[PDB]
Amino acid sequence: LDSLLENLRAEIDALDNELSDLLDKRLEIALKIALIKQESPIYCPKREQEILKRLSQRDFKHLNGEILTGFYTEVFKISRKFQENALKELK
Amino acid sequence: DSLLENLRAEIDALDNELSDLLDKRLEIALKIALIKQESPIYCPKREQEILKRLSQRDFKHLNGEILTGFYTEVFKISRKFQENALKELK
Ligand SMILES: O=C(O)C(=O)C[C@]1(C(=O)O)C=C[C@@H](O)C=C1
């Protein structure tokens, strides 16, 4: 019975705090990578596709390849732009 | 490189968790779809409330632009998923 809307939405909220915090940490790592490389462009397509491949093989209730592809397309965009901007300003 | 290999191992650990968290967030949205079958999926007030709330938190790098991008896609994923899950009921 604790599945009322209030409670499910608090659970979403806890998810979103963690998801946000993890995304923040993923940008800090991407910052470190940008700095040790400083490539003209940051785009490493082989690596992106390796990430997706590996994650696709894992066991999920609801995620599949379409959902991961959409999710990570945005994640990789966010990460790429962030690294670019970091390199523009620190130079 | 060497440093590079380690940073990428960390990304990998991160991405395992980020995926696991997204899968759990789909499960909860599934529960929500099911307790709310007589109503629209798109709740723009709630989406805005989520972003506002998350914008208030302390981040090293995230800002409003980055969260908006991220969650636009998260909400799209969540919306489509709920639709399709409800299509599998009678
Ligand atoms: O909280 C809800 O009402 C949901 O259905 C979940 C969610 C979300 O992904 O957070 C999904 C679709 C709506 O646009 C608003 C919120």
Side-chain angles (χ1 to χ4, degrees), chain A, chain B residues 1-2 4-37 39-57 59-90:
Chain A
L1 274 92
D2 263 349
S3 306
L4 298 121
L5 192 39
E6 286 86 340
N7 293 319
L8 293 170
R9 278 184 154 155
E11 287 210 38
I12 293 289
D13 287 353
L15 266 158
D16 287 336
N17 291 355
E18 291 192 65
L19 219 52
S20 291
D21 288 329
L22 282 183
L23 181 69
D24 203 44
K25 277 131 153 284
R26 194 194 202 284
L27 296 192
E28 160 75 8
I29 295 168
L31 181 52
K32 289 150 130 143
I33 287 159
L35 293 177
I36 66 164
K37 290 236 137 222
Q38 292 131 340
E39 292 313 36
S40 299
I42 295 298
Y43 189 36
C44 191
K46 185 164 295 186
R47 170 66 179 155
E48 291 187 3
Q49 273 300 300
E50 286 167 343
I51 290 176
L52 280 165
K53 239 164 287 170
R54 179 185 75 75
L55 295 161
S56 288
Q57 302 148 356
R58 306 181 79 235
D59 247 83
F60 295 117
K61 293 198 83 183
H62 309 287
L63 294 191
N64 54 36
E66 278 182 51
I67 292 172
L68 281 159
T69 293
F71 190 64
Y72 271 96
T73 292
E74 181 60 21
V75 174
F76 294 143
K77 282 190 192 142
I78 284 167
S79 182
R80 241 185 269 125
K81 272 145 46 150
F82 168 69
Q83 281 173 283
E84 300 289 0
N85 291 313
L87 286 185
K88 279 183 163 162
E89 189 189 350
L90 307 147
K91 79 335 155 210
Chain B
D1 207 279
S2 168
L4 188 43
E5 305 298 293
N6 286 323
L7 297 166
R8 283 178 156 164
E10 289 194 49
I11 289 291
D12 290 342
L14 188 147
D15 285 339
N16 295 338
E17 295 179 77
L18 208 54
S19 305
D20 285 344
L21 284 182
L22 178 70
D23 203 36
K24 274 139 154 277
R25 192 195 198 277
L26 292 189
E27 163 75 7
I28 292 171
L30 177 56
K31 284 150 135 153
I32 288 167
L34 296 176
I35 65 161
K36 278 286 272 283
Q37 288 167 46
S39 98
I41 288 176
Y42 187 37
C43 195
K45 188 161 299 181
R46 173 69 179 155
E47 291 185 5
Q48 221 188 25
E49 284 166 346
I50 286 179
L51 278 171
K52 236 165 291 170
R53 183 187 73 78
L54 293 161
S55 293
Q56 296 153 1
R57 306 180 76 227
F59 296 119
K60 294 202 80 198
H61 309 288
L62 297 193
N63 52 37
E65 284 187 87
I66 293 169
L67 277 166
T68 296
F70 188 63
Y71 271 96
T72 295
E73 183 55 28
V74 172
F75 298 142
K76 278 193 193 149
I77 287 169
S78 180
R79 247 181 270 125
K80 269 147 51 148
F81 168 92
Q82 281 176 252
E83 304 268 322
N84 292 310
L86 286 182
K87 290 178 174 166
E88 308 247 71
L89 66 82
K90 62 180 68 180

